[PDB]
Ligand binder design. Structure first.
Ligand SMILES: C/N=C(\NC)NC1CCN(CC(=O)NCc2ccc3[nH]c(-c4cnnn4C)nc3c2)CC1
Length: 105
């Protein structure tokens, strides 16, 4: 399971999930609601997947955790227009994540 040295990542993820702009990213992009996603996006990522990977020992390091966070935001900018609701949310969340990351380090 998660090593205690990564508790700061667990907290950042919890705070991301609680944010106003997190709604598009809480769960895997859902084919019932969004068409054509995996056609474009080779490596989907979302906060629930991250939460499980982190809590069960799937991230050895904070760098691996951060890489998945950035994958959420990179996928969002690949799939969505910048002025779409989801596109705007991705930019908000990237800034929020980077601020919290820099605050710890
Ligand atoms: C906290 N709730 C908010 N606060 C502003 N507003 C909601 C209002 C209702 N309504 C729902 C909606 O639309 N449910 C479909 C859905 C859900 C998750 C998605 N995730 C992506 C996505 C991720 N990456 N690319 N996409 C295209 N599309 C999604 C579509 C919008 C949210």
């Amino acid at each position: 399971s998660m090593h205690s040295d990564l508790t700061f990542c667990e907290i950042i993820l919890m705070e991301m999930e609680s944010h106003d702009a997190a709604w598009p990213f809480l769960e895997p992009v859902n084919p019932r609601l969004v068409s054509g996603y995996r056609r474009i996006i080779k490596n989907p990522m979302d906060f629930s997947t991250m939460r499980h990977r982190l809590s069960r020992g799937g991230y050895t390091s904070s760098e691996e955790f951060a890489a998945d966070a950035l994958l959420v935001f990179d996928n969002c900018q690949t799939f969505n227009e910048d002025d779409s609701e989801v596109g705007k949310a991705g930019h908000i969340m990237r800034r929020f994540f980077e601020s919290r990351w820099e605050e710890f380090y």
